[PDB]
C-alpha cells in the first residue's frame, strides 16, 4: 500500500510551495521482497504521539522514534506501534518516497474557534540528515527553505485541521435524527488504496476536513529496521517532525503565543519477519513523555558551521546566541559516549562570551 505517484517535472504553484522532493522514489538499499504482510486489527488504532501547547514563531521538534514511542490516548504500557517492535526483530518498509523508505503518516489536528487565525508549517526530515532538523530548531534556518514543506492555514472560517470519524458499525446509523452520517458506512466502503470521496462528503464539507499530513521516512542506507538503541545513537534512522505556527492573531489584532495542537500517527506500511519470544532486552518505551534527539559524533562540524554562517548568532541578547554559547560549552565538556543530546544544549550553564568559548574548544 501507500503508493508512489509520479509528479510532473515542474511543480504547479497552486498546490506546492517547495519543489518536489524527487521525481522518483529512492528504493535502493531496502529489501522489499523479504518479509510477510501481517494485517492485524491492532494496526488500525492511531497513536496520539504529541499533545499539548506549542510556541508560535519557533520550530518545535517532535522526535518520532517509533520503537520507544508513547501514546497519550491510552494508559497502557504498550500501544499499536510499539508492540509491533516488541513482537518482531525486522520491520521492512513497503514503499519509498523522495527522502527514504516510508513507514507511516502523521496527522496534525487542532480544534480552534473562529476568533483566532494563523498558519502551520510542517515537515518531517528523515534523521539521516539531523543537521537540517537541528538548524531549524535553533532558529538558524526556516522551514520554507527545504524541499517537502507544506503550509496549511488553520483559522478560521477554515475547515482544515479537524478529525471526523463516523463510527465503524455495520448498521451505518441509518436511523439518525435530523441529519446524515457522512462517510461512515452505508454510504461507501472506500478502499484504502483508492482515494475518493464517498458520495456524501462531496456536499457536506464540514465533515470532509482537508487534513494536515505528511509521511514518516526512515533513512536510505539500512536494509530493514532492526532496532538496537546503541547503533541508532551512532547512525540515526527514525525521523523528526518539525512544526512551526507562524502568525496567529486574535480578534483584538493581538499576536498570540502557545497554541494547542495534537499529533496522530500510524505505521501501516511495514512487513514483518523474525518473530521473537521471551526476550530480555526490549525497546523500553519511556513512560509518559517522549524520546529526545541524538546528535552523533560526525554531526558536530555541521551544526558548528551553520552557527558560523549566521549573522544573528554572534550578536548578544538574541535567542540564537543563547544556543550557540550552550553549544560551545557542551563541546568543551567530557563525553565518555560518542553523541550528545538536544537536552544537553538546553539545560547547560553559561560563560563569557563567544570567542573565548571557541579558543578553549580548539584545544580540547
Amino acid at each position: 500500500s501507500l503508493p508512489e505517484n509520479a509528479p510532473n517535472a515542474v511543480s504547479n504553484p497552486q498546490q506546492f510551495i517547495t519543489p518536489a522532493t524527487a521525481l522518483s522514489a529512492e528504493e535502493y538499499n531496502v529489501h522489499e521482497a523479504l518479509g510477510e504482510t501481517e494485517e492485524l486489527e491492532l494496526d488500525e488504532f492511531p497513536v496520539l504521539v504529541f499533545k499539548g501547547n506549542v510556541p508560535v514563531d519557533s520550530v518545535t521538534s517532535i522526535p518520532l522514534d517509533l520503537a520507544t514511542i508513547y501514546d497519550f490516548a491510552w494508559d497502557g504500557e504498550q500501544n499499536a506501534i510499539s508492540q509491533k517492535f516488541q513482537r518482531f526483530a525486522h520491520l521492512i518498509p513497503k514503499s519509498a518516497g523522495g527522502f527514504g523508505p516510508v513507514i507511516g503518516n502523521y496527522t496534525i489536528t487542532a480544534n480552534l474557534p473562529t476568533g483566532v487565525a494563523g498558519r502551520i508549517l510542517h515537515n518531517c526530515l528523515p534523521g539521516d540528515c539531523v543537521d537540517l532538523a537541528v538548524s531549524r530548531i535553533f532558529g538558524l534556518k526556516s522551514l520554507l527553505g527545504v524541499a517537502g514543506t507544506a503550509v496549511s492555514a488553520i483559522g478560521g472560517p477554515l475547515l482544515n485541521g479537524l478529525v471526523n470519524t463516523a463510527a465503524p458499525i455495520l448498521s451505518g446509523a441509518a436511523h439518525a435524527i435530523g441529519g446524515n452520517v457522512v462517510g461512515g458506512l452505508a454510504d461507501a466502503v472506500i478502499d484504502i488504496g483508492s482515494n475518493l470521496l464517498t458520495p456524501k462528503e462531496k456536499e457536506q464539507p464540514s465533515a470532509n476536513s482537508s487534513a494536515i499530513s505528511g509521511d514518516i521516512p526512515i533513512s536510505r542506507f539500512v536494509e530493514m529496521l532492526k532496532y538496537v538503541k546503541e547503533n541508532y545513537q551512532d547512525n540515526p534512522v527514525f525521523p523528526t517532525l518539525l512544526v512551526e505556527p507562524q502568525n496567529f492573531i486574535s480578534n483584538a489584532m493581538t499576536a498570540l503565543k502557545t497554541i494547542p495542537i495534537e499529533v496522530f500517527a500510524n505505521m501501516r506500511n511495514v512487513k514483518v519477519e523474525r518473530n521473537l519470544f521471551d526476550r530480555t532486552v526490549v525497546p523500553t518505551v519511556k513512560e509518559a513523555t517522549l524520546a529526545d534527539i541524538v546528535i552523533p559524533n560526525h554531526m558536530y562540524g555541521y551544526i558548528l558551521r551553520d552557527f558560523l554562517q549566521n549573522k544573528r548568532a554572534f550578536q548578544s541578547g538574541t535567542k540564537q546566541n543563547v544556543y550557540f554559547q550552550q553549544f560551545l560549552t557542551v563541546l568543551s565538556q567530557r563525553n565518555i559516549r560518542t553523541h550528545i543530546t538536544l537536552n544537553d544544549i538546553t539545560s547547560c550553564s553559561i560563560d563569557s562570551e563567544s570567542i573565548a568559548n571557541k579558543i578553549e574548544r580548539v584545544k580540547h
Binding site: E41, L42, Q86, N275
Partner: protein, 241 residues
C-alpha cells in the same frame, strides 16, 4: 540411517485438528492460515494470531514416572495472566490483551481453542502410554505412546459443560468468552508403563501453539503484566454474598 532407536508414532496426518491453521512445517518467514469460524453467523475480521501460530512455545515440564494410583492430574493453562507467556517482544498474551472477545473452532462438535504438543524422547529401555483428556469433563481422549508425538486441542474451562459457581448465561449460549475468562486445562495420567533398571524418570515438555483461537473486538494494547496484587482471581471467580 542405521542406528538402534525406538522413535516413531502416528505421523500427524492421521490426527484430526486442522493442519492448515496448525501447520506441521511452516515456511521460514510465512504466516499461518486463518482458522475456521464456529458458525457462519458470528462476527469476523482479519486474524491477529498468524505469526504467533507458527511457534511452539515452551510452557511446562511434566515428569513421567511409574504410577501408583489411578487419578488424573490437571494442567491449567491461563493465557491471560501467567508470567511465562508474557515475557517481552512477541509473546502469547498479546492477542488476549488487544481484544474483548475470543473463541475457537467447532470442527469436532464443541468449541476447542488452544492446542498443546507432547513430544516424548525415550531410550529403548522404557515403554508406555500417556493418556491426555481434553478437559475436566468426559471429553475426547488422546493416547501418547512413549517415543511419539501428538497434538491436543483443548476445551476452555467455561465450555466444558459443568455447572460451576460462576456459570454465566452467555457461557452456554454464545461462542464468545470475554477474554480474561478463557483459561483452558487438560488432564493427564500414565496409563501404561514398563521399564528396566536403567532409566526411571523420562522428563517431557509441553509446547503450546495458540492454534485456532479467534478474536472479535480490537482495542489498543493493554499493559502486559499486573505487578501489583495477585489476589485478583479470588475477587473474580468466587463472588461472596
Amino acid at each position: 540411517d542405521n542406528e538402534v532407536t525406538a522413535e516413531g508414532g502416528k505421523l500427524v496426518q492421521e490426527l484430526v485438528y486442522d493442519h492448515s491453521a496448525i501447520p506441521v512445517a511452516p515456511v521460514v518467514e510465512t504466516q499461518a492460515e486463518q482458522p475456521e469460524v464456529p458458525v457462519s453467523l458470528v462476527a469476523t475480521r482479519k486474524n491477529d494470531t498468524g505469526h504467533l501460530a507458527t511457534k511452539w512455545y515452551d510452557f511446562a515440564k511434566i515428569s513421567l514416572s511409574n504410577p501408583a494410583n489411578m487419578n488424573w492430574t490437571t494442567l491449567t493453562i491461563d493465557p491471560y495472566n501467567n508470567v511465562t507467556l508474557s515475557r517481552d517482544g512477541e509473546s502469547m498474551v498479546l492477542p488476549w490483551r488487544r481484544n474483548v472477545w475470543t473463541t475457537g473452532s467447532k470442527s469436532i462438535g464443541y468449541i476447542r481453542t488452544m492446542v498443546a504438543q507432547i513430544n516424548i524422547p525415550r531410550p529403548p529401555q522404557i515403554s508406555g502410554v500417556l493418556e491426555v483428556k481434553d478437559s475436566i469433563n468426559n471429553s475426547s481422549i488422546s493416547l501418547v505412546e512413549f517415543g511419539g508425538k501428538v497434538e491436543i486441542p483443548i476445551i476452555p474451562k467455561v465450555m466444558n459443560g459443568l455447572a460451576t459457581t460462576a456459570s454465566l448465561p452467555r457461557h452456554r449460549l454464545n461462542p464468545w468468552m470475554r477474554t480474561a475468562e478463557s483459561k483452558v486445562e487438560l488432564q493427564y495420567r500414565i496409563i501404561a508403563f514398563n521399564r528396566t533398571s536403567d532409566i526411571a524418570d523420562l522428563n517431557v515438555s509441553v509446547l503450546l501453539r495458540p492454534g485456532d483461537s479467534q478474536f472479535q473486538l480490537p482495542m489498543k494494547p493493554d499493559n502486559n503484566v499486573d505487578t501489583r496484587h495477585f489476589e485478583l482471581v479470588e475477587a473474580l471467580m468466587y463472588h461472596y454474598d
